[PDB]
């Protein structure tokens, strides 16, 4: 049903809340929620951890099952799989883990796959634990996505720093 609420519009199509991803999805009932996903789909911690408890460890399942037959995806690609009971299809999305010394000119590519759905609810790629400078997350957001995304950042100061970041 795509109803996002309380979100600040930073231009004709990117969207920013401080919110967490999964509370989002509850409440929005999305048609795509991106998973900040890594190349063989192991959702343990972070965002992806997060998603995957949410469906009762469901996501988990099906990304192993696609692995087995399939191998893992490259960094800056994307697949497709179900979005259980989050959303009707999940984005698995890999963006550059620059404190694993990933190249972060893959963030471009990572978000390109964003324009593939007309409306998506997604994180911040390649920020926490990935190690991306979250401003330059920003930035590539904003130059690369056509489409309607709804970023959720679930972290009061960083959204803020953001926030005032991109209104400078
Ligand atoms: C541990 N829980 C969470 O991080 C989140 C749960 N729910 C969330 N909704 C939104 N953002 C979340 N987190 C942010 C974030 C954005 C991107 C990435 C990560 C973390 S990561 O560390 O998992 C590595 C992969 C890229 C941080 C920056 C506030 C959470």
Same mark, same amino acid.
């Given at each position: 049903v795509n109803s996002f609420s309380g979100y600040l519009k930073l231009t004709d199509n990117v969207y920013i809340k401080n919110a967490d991803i999964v509370e989002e999805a509850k409440k929005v009932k999305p048609t795509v929620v991106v998973n900040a996903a890594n190349v063989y789909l192991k #959702?343990?911690?972070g965002v992806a951890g997060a998603l995957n408890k949410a469906t009762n460890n469901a996501m988990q399942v099906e990304s192993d099952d696609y692995i087995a037959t399939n191998g893992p995806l490259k960094v800056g690609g994307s697949c497709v799989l179900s979005g259980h009971? %989050?959303?009707? #299809?999940?984005?698995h999305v890999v963006g550059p883990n620059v404190n694993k010394?990933?190249?972060?000119? %893959?963030l471009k590519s990572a978000y390109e796959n964003?324009?593939? #759905?007309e409306v998506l609810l997604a994180p911040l790629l390649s920020a926490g634990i990935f190690g991306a400078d979250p401003i330059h997350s920003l930035r590539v957001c904003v130059d690369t996505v056509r489409t309607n995304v709804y970023l959720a950042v679930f972290d009061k100061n960083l959204y803020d720093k953001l926030v005032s970041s991109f209104l400078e």
């Open positions: #959702h343990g911690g009971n %989050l959303a009707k #299809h999940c984005l010394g990933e190249d972060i000119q %893959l964003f324009n593939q #759905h």
